[PDB]
Amino acid sequence: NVSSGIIHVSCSPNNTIVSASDPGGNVLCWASSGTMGFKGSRKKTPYSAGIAADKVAKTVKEMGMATVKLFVKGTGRGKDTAIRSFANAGLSITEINEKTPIPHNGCKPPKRPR
Amino acid sequence: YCRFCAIGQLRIDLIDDLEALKRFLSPYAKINPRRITGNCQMHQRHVAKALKRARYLALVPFVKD
Amino acid sequence: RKNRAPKRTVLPDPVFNNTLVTRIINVIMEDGKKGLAQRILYGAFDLIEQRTKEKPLTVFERAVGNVMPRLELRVRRIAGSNYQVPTEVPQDRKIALALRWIAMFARKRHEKTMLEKIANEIIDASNNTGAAIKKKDDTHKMAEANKAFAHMRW
Amino acid sequence: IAKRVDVAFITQRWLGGTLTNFKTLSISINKLNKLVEKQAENAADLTKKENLMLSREIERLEKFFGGVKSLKRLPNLLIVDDPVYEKNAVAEANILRIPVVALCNTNTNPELVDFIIPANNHQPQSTCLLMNLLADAVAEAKAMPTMFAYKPDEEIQIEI
Amino acid sequence: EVKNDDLELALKKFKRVSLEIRRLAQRHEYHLRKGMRLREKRKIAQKKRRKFR
RNA sequence: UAUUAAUCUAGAGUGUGGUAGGGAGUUUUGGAAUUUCAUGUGGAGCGGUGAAAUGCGUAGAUAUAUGAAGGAACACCAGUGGCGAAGGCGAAAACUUAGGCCAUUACUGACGCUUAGGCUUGAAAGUGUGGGGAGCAAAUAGGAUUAGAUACCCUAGUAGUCCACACCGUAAACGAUAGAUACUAGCUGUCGGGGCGAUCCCCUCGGUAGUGAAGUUAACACAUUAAGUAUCUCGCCUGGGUAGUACAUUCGCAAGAAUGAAACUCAAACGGAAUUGACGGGGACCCGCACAAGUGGUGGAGCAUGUUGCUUAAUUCGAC
RNA sequence: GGUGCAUGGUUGUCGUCAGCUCGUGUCGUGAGAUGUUGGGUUAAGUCCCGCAACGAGCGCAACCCUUAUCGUUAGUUACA
């Protein structure tokens, strides 16, 4: 594939997804926490996100990529460790941007988990 | 570190002391609270209004640097 | 809450000149005697150079060096789905665990006179064929399997 | 003050009650003096651990009674270096009928001392002068040579 | 929130930024009220006036 | 005590000069971000809690990036806060703009304040009409821990939530603190005014807060804004369930609300605060073969021992 | 013979846990506090600094029995 591209990472309290994509929008590959034998509680841990990120970085290095753009969209605790995984997995980083769905104080969110 | 009672202009508006307004504005497009600015807070609340206007005027981004 | 206590290691077995030898003799202990497990170990060595020939001292030190584990797993639970967390242990408990493994896998078996079965057990544990090396490999491989729960350490 | 005029004084912890309650403290100081006298009379009659415990107890009693062990009678008058620093002293003096003399500070209260004197402890120029002159009052009362209270500017004892 | 310092130093500086965004945007998944919002604003004001002063 | 006349204002308030605030309502604009729509890609997951599950999904779901429509509210700014009749107000702006603040000597000249009557508002829900349901969510549907469970949670989804005429005119309407007048430290800290200086560290008087002197309170705790000091006035509590049930007045299309009982029973009221303990799916501290380890032993088996349910001519009783 | 729902005497139990307290006194209108708590130390409130505090008792330990180095009373039926 193209040497350039963007790696995107999204996180929800019980899900993580990471996708390597062309700069135009079309993806080249993607993985998630449920792709492995850690579905559920073990997939809310940074380990699942790190392994998924390493898997996508490795499979896009085989597909062809280099120093990548960083698009994080979400409010997960592993949104910083995923970038470290990208950096150490060969898909090194130079800059990082925010595509997060962070809302300026708005409308009703879902019910309260407690 | 006040920038409007110190300058003595005492006149706050959109564009006449923008750098003074930004003195309380972090590069992160976020304004420091009273416990950090530590000023008379007439000028700090004027900064609040002016820089929220600037965000509305797209001088500084909402969520960006 | 008790803390680090003065564990003591007795004088080595003065017929083979090794503390691990006397520890092994005192872990496979039957009826309480050391004149018993000493004969057991001597006959085991004799049958070792009889079948599966190897020098007792070198094979013993190699087994001691190899069968030692790497880490330990502490059980952690909060609400449900209990898991393990890695922890480090001094080598004394490692060689003690080796002692216990040898005693358990030797004292209990069919396949007649205990001399040859314990010789075979110690030889297999020595040449890296799985009798206690498999545990050492697993405990290393176990940490990377439940690392999602291993990371949750306080 | 003590080396200029011999007088009982308290320098260690003024205990929280040593004038309104001094009976069981009189017996305590008597036990201390008697034990010291016995130790002077004693010369290693027991095991050394018991001697270590004896010294242990002596020093335990000293670290609380080190100030209040020189007077065997309740004072008829006391001075104070700071009304808030000597809460126990002023409390036990107000339980009795003895007047209080203190070096009041602006953070203190002036409704607590029978003799309010605006003497600073943060600024030593007042407290040193007042201590010297309080010594000199009883010195000249006892017909001995007097050091200060007649000088326009006494010794500059400025604390760093 | 862009961070471009070095290959790894950029992420080292981005750690604090990510922490700030995570703590700021965490309040869009549970119940909240505007009066309680002013309440917690006063509470964090007291926290930073007592600890951070 | 009240009236008479006018100059004095000194509270009622008013003028000149300045003046902070997200006050309120109405109006104007905007998109960060989601959904629909457009481009795509992609392989096997997404959705999520306590573990998971309902549910979406190979027809392309989740994801991936922006853009038009849409509507919600507008990360920080946000103050030991301001404003505000409590009620409530945070993108920005405009109109009316209420009231906060002093320099207020000056000014009609006691005009004043409370105030049952009355007037208004009082959050939000919900709901009559017109919209969106993009997003949320009562009700609803499912999974799930409780012995079930409607209750924790998660997912979705109607009215509604959001807007305007609005209604219910009810609250945890909280400072749980009715207003107005005169006075009362210091200090801690946020703010306004005038004054004069670089801003904080300057003074004065006030708004909203606290420790705390005197003062007050049953103590906790108020304390310059009192629960103080005294005054003025209104309403209420003279026990709890009975008791918002009886009658009954009033508001409402709607969902529902304001005032308001008894017979009967208790010596009490989910009375209050402080006050000593242990527990906490609240912890700090201090330690123990209290826990891991092996040794073992028993629970697995045999007898040896004594008992227990049973059986006896007694199977002696208790230790449970 | 029974009622340990009278118990004694004797214990077990927490636990050999480091706690239980008390007299002098003061504050709180009151229950209550204080000294003991905290922090240092052998299991150890064996013990200490500190304070509305001062000391003192119980538990505990040093002290007692056994193991224990040398010497000492003395040597057989231990020894031999």
From Swiss-Prot, chain A:
Coiled coil segments of this chain: none
GO cellular component: ribonucleoprotein complex; ribosome
InterPro entries: Ribosomal_uS11, Ribosomal_uS11_bac-type, Ribosomal_uS11_CS, Ribosomal_uS11_sf
SUPFAM superfamilies per UniProt: Translational machinery components
SS bond partners: none
Keywords, alphabetical: Ribonucleoprotein, Ribosomal protein, RNA-binding, rRNA-binding
Matches recorded under Gene3D superfamilies: Ribosomal protein S11 (3.30.420.80)
Any Pfam family: Ribosomal_S11
Domain of life: Bacteria
GO biological process terms, semicolon-separated: translation
GO terms of molecular function: rRNA binding; structural constituent of ribosome
Subunit structure: Part of the 30S ribosomal subunit. Interacts with proteins S7 and S18. Binds to IF-3.
NCBIfam families with a match to the protein in the record: PRK05309.1, uS11_bact
Family of this protein: Belongs to the universal ribosomal protein uS11 family.
PANTHER family (alphabetical): 40S RIBOSOMAL PROTEIN S14/30S RIBOSOMAL PROTEIN S11
Main function: Located on the platform of the 30S subunit, it bridges several disparate RNA helices of the 16S rRNA. Forms part of the Shine-Dalgarno cleft in the 70S ribosome.
Protein name: Small ribosomal subunit protein uS11
Lineage of the species this protein comes from: Bacteria, Bacillati, Mycoplasmatota, Mycoplasmoidales, Mycoplasmoidaceae
UniProtKB/Swiss-Prot annotation, chain B:
Signal sequence bounds: none
Reported function: Binds as a heterodimer with protein bS6 to the central domain of the 16S rRNA, where it helps stabilize the platform of the 30S subunit.
Keyword list, A-Z: Ribonucleoprotein, Ribosomal protein, RNA-binding, rRNA-binding
Protein name: Small ribosomal subunit protein bS18
Protein's UniProt keywords contain rRNA-binding: yes
Disulfide bonds listed in the record: none
GO cellular component, one term: cytosolic small ribosomal subunit
Membership in a protein family: Belongs to the bacterial ribosomal protein bS18 family.
Self-association state and partner proteins as the record states: Part of the 30S ribosomal subunit. Forms a tight heterodimer with protein bS6.
Example GO BP: translation
GO MF terms held by the record: small ribosomal subunit rRNA binding; structural constituent of ribosome
Record keyword Zinc present: no
Swiss-Prot record, chain C:
Family statement drawn from the similarity comment of this UniProt entry: Belongs to the universal ribosomal protein uS7 family.
GO biological process: translation
HAMAP family in the record: Ribosomal_uS7_B (MF_00480_B)
Summary of the function given for this chain in its UniProt record: One of the primary rRNA binding proteins, it binds directly to 16S rRNA where it nucleates assembly of the head domain of the 30S subunit. Is located at the subunit interface close to the decoding center, probably blocks exit of the E-site tRNA.
Record's keyword terms, sorted: Ribonucleoprotein, Ribosomal protein, RNA-binding, rRNA-binding, tRNA-binding
Record InterPro entries: Ribosomal_uS7 (IPR000235), Ribosomal_uS7_bac/org-type (IPR005717), Ribosomal_uS7_CS (IPR020606), Ribosomal_uS7_dom (IPR023798), Ribosomal_uS7_dom_sf (IPR036823)
Organism of provenance: Mycoplasma pneumoniae (strain ATCC 29342 / M129 / Subtype 1)
GO molecular function: rRNA binding; structural constituent of ribosome; tRNA binding
Annotated Gene Ontology cellular component terms: small ribosomal subunit
Name of the featured protein: Small ribosomal subunit protein uS7
Keyword rRNA processing attached: no
NCBIfam families: rpsG_bact (TIGR01029)
PROSITE patterns xrefs: RIBOSOMAL_S7
Complexes and interactors: Part of the 30S ribosomal subunit. Contacts proteins S9 and S11.
First and last residue of the signal peptide: none
Curated annotation (Swiss-Prot), chain D:
Keyword annotations from UniProtKB, A to Z: Ribonucleoprotein, Ribosomal protein
Alphabetized GO MF terms: structural constituent of ribosome
Record's keyword annotation contains Ribonucleoprotein: yes
Keyword match Ribonucleoprotein: yes
One GO biological process term: translation
Gene Ontology CC annotations of this record: cytosolic small ribosomal subunit
Superkingdom as given in the UniProt entry: Bacteria
Family to which the UniProt record says this protein belongs: Belongs to the universal ribosomal protein uS2 family.
Name under which the protein is recorded: Small ribosomal subunit protein uS2
UniProt source species: Mycoplasma pneumoniae (strain ATCC 29342 / M129 / Subtype 1) (Mycoplasmoides pneumoniae)
Residues of the whole record sequence present: 99 to 258 of 294
